Amino acid sequence: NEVPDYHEDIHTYLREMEVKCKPKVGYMKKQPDITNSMRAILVDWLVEVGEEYKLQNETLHLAVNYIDRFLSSMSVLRGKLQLVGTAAMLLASKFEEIYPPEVAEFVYITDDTYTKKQVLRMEHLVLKVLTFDLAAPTVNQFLTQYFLHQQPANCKVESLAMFLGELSLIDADPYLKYLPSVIAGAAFHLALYTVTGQSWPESLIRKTGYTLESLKPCLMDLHQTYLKAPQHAQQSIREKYKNSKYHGVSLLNPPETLNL
Amino acid sequence: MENFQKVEKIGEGTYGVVYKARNKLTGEVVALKKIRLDTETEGVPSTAIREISLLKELNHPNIVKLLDVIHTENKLYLVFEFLHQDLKKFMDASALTGIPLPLIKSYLFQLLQGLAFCHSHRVLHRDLKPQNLLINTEGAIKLADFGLARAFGVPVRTYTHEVVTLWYRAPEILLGCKYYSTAVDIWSLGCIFAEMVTRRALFPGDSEIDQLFRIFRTLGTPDEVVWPGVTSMPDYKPSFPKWARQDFSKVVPPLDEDGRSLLSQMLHYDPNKRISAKAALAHPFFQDVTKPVPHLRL
Numbered sequence: 001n002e003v004p005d006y007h008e009d010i011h012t013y014l015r016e017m018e019v020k021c022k023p024k025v026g027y028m029k030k031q032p033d034i035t036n037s038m039r040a041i042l043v044d045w046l047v048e049v050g051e052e053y054k055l056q057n058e059t060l061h062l063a064v065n066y067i068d069r070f071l072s073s074m075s076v077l078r079g080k081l082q083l084v085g086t087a088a089m090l091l092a093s094k095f096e097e098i099y100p101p102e103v104a105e106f107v108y109i110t111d112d113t114y115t116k117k118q119v120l121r122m123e124h125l126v127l128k129v130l131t132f133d134l135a136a137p138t139v140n141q142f143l144t145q146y147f148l149h150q151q152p153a154n155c156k157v158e159s160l161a162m163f164l165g166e167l168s169l170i171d172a173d174p175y176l177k178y179l180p181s182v183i184a185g186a187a188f189h190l191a192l193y194t195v196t197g198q199s200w201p202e203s204l205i206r207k208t209g210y211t212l213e214s215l216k217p218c219l220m221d222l223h224q225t226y227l228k229a230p231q232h233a234q235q236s237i238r239e240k241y242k243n244s245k246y247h248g249v250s251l252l253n254p255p256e257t258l259n260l
Numbered sequence: 261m262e263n264f265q266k267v268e269k270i271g272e273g274t275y276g277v278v279y280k281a282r283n284k285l286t287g288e289v290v291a292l293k294k295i296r297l298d299t300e301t302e303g304v305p306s307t308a309i310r311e312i313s314l315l316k317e318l319n320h321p322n323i324v325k326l327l328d329v330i331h332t333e334n335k336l337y338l339v340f341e342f343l344h345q346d347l348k349k350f351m352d353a354s355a356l357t358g359i360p361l362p363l364i365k366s367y368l369f370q371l372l373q374g375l376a377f378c379h380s381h382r383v384l385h386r387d388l389k390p391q392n393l394l395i396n397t398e399g400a401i402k403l404a405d406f407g408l409a410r411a412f413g414v415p416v417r418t419y420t421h422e423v424v425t426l427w428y429r430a431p432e433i434l435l436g437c438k439y440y441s442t443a444v445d446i447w448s449l450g451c452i453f454a455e456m457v458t459r460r461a462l463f464p465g466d467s468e469i470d471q472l473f474r475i476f477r478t479l480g481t482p483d484e485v486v487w488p489g490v491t492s493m494p495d496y497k498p499s500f501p502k503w504a505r506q507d508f509s510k511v512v513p514p515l516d517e518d519g520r521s522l523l524s525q526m527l528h529y530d531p532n533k534r535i536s537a538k539a540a541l542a543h544p545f546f547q548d549v550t551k552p553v554p555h556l557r558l
């Protein structure tokens with residue numbers, strides 16, 4: 001980790017993998033039973049699940065990526081949408097967690113709507129469909145890369161950027177059309193601006209090649225999501241980010257203008 | 261699995277066994293790692309999940325190749341390129357005659373290349389020990405055993421069930437650090453370099469306190485001037501004996517002034533200050549590296 005020698009290299013490699021892990025932006029139009037809203041309810045529930053099991057934020061992001069990729073190429077009936085969500089969470093825990101929760105927990109959290117074997121087989125199916133390509137780049141990962149450019153570090157800014165980035169997971173609605181490095185660039189500038197009133201650093205511009213102009217389109221969207229947040233049908237994330245652990249940033253008032 | 265002819269068991273594992281095998285259609289020689297599969301209470305093991313997904317992004321001459329994964333019912337096989345032996349047995353084999361200095365420099369050089377490759381693709385090996393390094397009659401050495409590997413695009417946390425064998429364990433881990441870093445991997449390598457050079461393990465501790473003590477007796481007890489932060493670490497004790505750093509000239513007698521320099525930098529206490537594989541490759545120690553072939557007693 002902490003030896004500057006590879007920061008660039010790692011960033012560059014992540015920018016490449018991100019393009020290749022990409023799921024179909026428009027897969028939901030082509031999906032029979034399930035809908036963007038069904039998805040929102042699923043991701044929101046996964047947030048709870050994470051909370052309930054004390055899993056990392058990275059386990060959540062990964063799991064979501066596995067879901068949107070699995071869904072860009074397998075028709076799933078709304079009543080199996082949760083089996084897919086659960087296997088994705090189990091897989092992301094196995095990859096990311098120090099030691100994951102037992103399948104038992106996963107079958108349990110479903111109020112037993114599914115069996116252990118259904119959970120395992122779906123696990124085999126997801127692995128096949130994703131072709132063991134589980135080490136995907138995430139918003140979290142890009143945020144981490146960016147936080148290293150803070151003059152100086154601010155843990156309140158971080159919490160906020162983590163909040164906005166996490167909110168993007170709920171809405172395929174507008175989100176599926178942006179690269180993780182982008183939603184991350186926007187979450188970072190919004191959070192930073194809201195908290196310290198400062199903007200997307202010139203060092204991040206040179207590092208990523210993104211200009212505030214570039215992030216504008218995503219910026220406008222993230223912002224409207226932030227504003228509309230208390231009204232959103234899904235609340236798990238807002239409730240989670242109003243804890244001391246996150247400097248209660250979800251209660252932090254969003255600017256009414258990006259003064260962009 | 262029907263296109264494989266099992267030749268001979270070449271190993272065991274906590275979750276598997278390794279056989280040498282031959283592809284009956286292509287004749288390609290391979291290593292098959294089998295995994296039974298808890299198709300009820302576990303599913304694909306976490307070790308397998310991480311080894312597969314990470315190894316598959318790491319194609320490099322100095323990293324053992326994962327050729328295929330034959331996933332099925334309640335059996336998972338990993339298919340790998342095959343190498344003759346590991347550095348542990350080679351090293352034993354060479355006690356007496358010793359491993360020629362130019363071959364040691366070649367081995368170090370190649371391991372650093374595989375490692376730098378891993379590091380810049382955000383993968384920490386975390387289990388670098390002589391038996392996890394494979395060699396061939398041609399003079400190549402490759403990183404192997406990614407069973408403890410972890411992607412670090414987001415900080416890797418230290419866990420007491422996932423850690424190198426003691427002798428190759430970094431001081432920070434021993435002192436209770438929270439996160440792993442590339443540095444831990446460079447430490448293992450420094451230790452291995454000294455072992456090849458001397459024919460004796462560098463710090464062969466009996467326990468964690470014994471391990472730390474052996475490191476201290478050699479490198480000196482770390483202070484705040486040396487490793488700003490030590491005194492505050494979780495398993496640091498003010499009661500620790502205060503020892504002094506010895507002459508590397510006395511630690512690794514056969515190494516020249518250049519080889520000693522690289523070594524002290526790979527053994528640096530401050531993980532933020534320990535040399536990186538990427539940087540070590542620049543070291544003047546390699547300005548004449550060559551690619552000798554080993555005498556394997558296969």
Ligand SMILES: Nc1ncnc2c1ncn2[C@@H]1O[C@H](COP(=O)(O)OP(=O)(O)OP(=O)(O)O)[C@@H](O)[C@H]1O
Binds near residue numbers: 340341394407
């Ligand atoms: N590509 C390979 N070519 C030849 N032999 C190999 C290859 N990969 C592994 N082996 C052999 O399999 C042996 C033993 O099994 P295993 O891989 O489980 O390694 P190990 O270090 O013994 O680790 P552990 O038992 O902790 O899993 C290794 O020591 C090695 O010699």
